[PDB]
Every structure is written in C-alpha cells, then in structure tokens.
C-alpha cells in the first residue's frame, strides 16, 4: 500500500550486498520490490567525469558530482517507485557518501545538508564487521583487493591489504558515529549470513505488517 525505503550500510566485505539481495529475494515473493546500489552511478556522473578526465578533481567536486548524479537517480527512479508503493532496497545509501566524502575532508555538516533533499530510509541496517574480518573473507575468496577498496587515492604508499584495513577502518568509524543520529539498526556481521538475514527479515516483517 505504501512505499518503503530499506537501506544497507557496511564496508566492502561485510556482506551487506548479499544481505540486500537475500532480502529482495524474500520480499519479492509477496510485494513489488526494487533493489539498487549506491555504486550504480548513472549518466550525469559519466558525462562530468569523462569531460574532466585530464583535470585533477578535489574531494569537494567529487562530492558534488556524486550528489548531482544521485539527485537525478532519486527523481528519475527511486522517488517515483516509492510513491508508487514499491519497496526500495538500497545496497549502500547516502550514508556511504557521508563516509567517503568526510574521510576525504569534506565537512560532515555540509554533506548532510547537501543530501537533505533525499528522504531518510524507513530502516537502515548497518552490517558491522571489523576490517580485519572483512579482509580475511576477501583473501579466502582468492580475489584481489581493488584500489578503491584500499582507498588508494588517499593511501597510495600502502599495500592493498594495509590500505584496505586503514581505509575501511575510517569508513567504519564514520558509520559508528552515525549510528545514534541516523537510528542505524546495528547487526553483528560476524554471524552467519543466514542468521543475519533472519534477524533482518524479522525487523522488516514487523515493519511491513505495520505499514498501512
């Protein structure tokens, strides 16, 4: 009957992506649902970054490019679907921008005001896990750490492993500082994917049943 916005926040390797997908799989059995990812930038993002590919951009300009691109995604896809009664699940939401931008020196209060045009999630799940554990999982999966996951732009002198630990650690600190103000539902990401999802569904089930 009413649209609902569910957000997932967590570091790379925390498993929040899997949890968002698992929740979509369950919700779609009964209701219309749309799953998106913060990382899924659109056309404005591409036009500006390509146009300025030869120039060195500042954290502030990147913050604005991302907000600009999101403002379009928001009005074009997200908000319309919510108004239509869709349940929207976002694998990483505006809080990821809060973290990525503030860790790079952009004023936190300014970034919050910048994104004030966007509605807050009905529920935000923070899949919390130590960067050390997240790293172990990535190592065991045999895949390599991406420069972005290692915050290579900030820590080019560190190995991908050390960069990951330092950078994801800073992202974790931002999320931790946002928990109380943003009413994050903190989930112990060290638990099994199944136990985590069960907890999530209990929270979401209660939410939807009381949604009318």
Report the binding-site residues for ATP: 10-17
Q: If DSSP codes are grouped into helix, strand and coil, which group holds residue 34?
A: strand
Contact 171, 103 (CB under 8 A): yes
**33 beta partners:** 87
- Does 40 bind a second copy (CB under 8 A)? Our answer is no
- Does 60 bind a second copy (CB under 8 A)? Our answer is yes
- Does 54 bind a second copy (CB under 8 A)? Our answer is yes
H-helix or E-strand spanning residue 186: strand 185-188
Rounded Cα–Cα distance for residues 67 and 54 (Å): 21
Rounded Cα–Cα distance for residues 183 and 83 (Å): 23
Q: How far is the CB of 105 from a second copy (least distance, A)?
A: 11
Give me 21's structure tokens: 């997908």
- Does 52 bind a second copy (CB under 8 A)? Our answer is yes
The interface mask with Cl ion, positions 4-23, x = CB under 5 A, is -------xx-----------
Contact 62, 153 (CB under 8 A): no
- Does 171 bind Cl ion (CB under 5 A)? Our answer is yes
From candidates 25, 32, 72, 132, binder to a second copy by CB under 8 A: 72
Judged by the rule CB under 8 A, the positions of this chain that interact with a second copy are 42-44, 46-48, 50-52, 54-58, 60-61, 64-65, 67-68, 71-72, 75-76, 107, 110, 113-114, 116-117
């Amino acid at each position: 009957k009413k649209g609902v916005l569910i957000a997932f926040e967590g570091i790379d390797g925390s498993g929040k992506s899997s949890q968002a997908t698992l929740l979509k799989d369950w919700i779609e059995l009964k209701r219309d649902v749309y799953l998106t990812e913060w990382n899924s930038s659109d056309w404005i993002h591409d036009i500006i970054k390509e146009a300025k590919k030869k120039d060195l951009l500042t954290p502030l300009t990147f913050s604005l490019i991302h907000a600009t691109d999101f403002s379009d995604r928001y009005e074009r896809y997200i908000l319309p679907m919510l108004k239509s009664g869709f349940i929207v699940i976002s694998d990483r939401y505006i809080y990821t921008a809060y973290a990525r931008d503030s860790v790079r020196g952009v004023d936190i209060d300014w970034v919050k005001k910048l994104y004030s045009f966007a509605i807050k999630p009905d529920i935000t799940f923070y899949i919390r896990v130590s960067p050390d554990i997240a790293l172990e999982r990535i190592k065991k999966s045999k895949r390599k750490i991406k420069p972005q996951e290692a915050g290579a732009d900030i820590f080019p002198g560190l190995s991908p492993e050390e960069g990951f630990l330092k950078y994801q650690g800073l992202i974790t600190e931002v999320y931790d500082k946002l928990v109380k103000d943003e009413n994050f539902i903190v989930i112990d990401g060290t638990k099994t994917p199944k136990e985590i999802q069960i907890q999530i569904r209990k929270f979401v089930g209660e939410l939807i049943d009381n949604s009318f």
